[PDB]
UniProtKB/Swiss-Prot annotation:
The lineage of its organism: Eukaryota, Metazoa, Chordata, Craniata, Vertebrata. It is found in: Nucleus. Acts as a basic transcriptional regulator. Represses basic transcription driven by several virus and cellular promoters. When associated with BRD7, activates transcription of glucocorticoid-responsive promoter in the absence of ligand-stimulation. Also plays a role in mRNA processing and transport. Binds avidly to poly(G) and poly(C) RNA homopolymers in vitro. Methylated. This is Heterogeneous nuclear ribonucleoprotein U-like protein 1. Coiled coil: none annotated. The chain holds residues 1 to 37 of 856 of the full protein. Interacts with the adenovirus type 5 (Ad5) E1B-55 kDa, BRD7, PRMT2, TP53 and NXF1. Associates with histones and BRD7. Its methylation is enhanced in the late phase of adenoviral infection. Residues 10-44 form the SAP domain. The RGG-box domain is methylated. It comes from the Eukaryota.
Length: 50
């Protein structure tokens, strides 16, 4: 097992990395790097409880 929480630093992902992911998710690839990071992260965030 791995202590703490997941280790997915979307921020660490350059603009190119986020652009590729966002595109694969049909998500807009506009805005600054930070914007792209939040966009992709927002989609990943699955608060779905059950």
């Amino acid at each position: 097992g791995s202590s703490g929480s997941s280790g997915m630093d979307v921020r660490r992902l350059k603009v190119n990395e986020l652009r590729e992911e966002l595109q694969r998710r049909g998500l807009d690839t506009r805005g600054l790097k930070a914007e792209l990071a939040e966009r992709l992260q927002a989609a990943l965030s699955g608060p779905s409880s059950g």
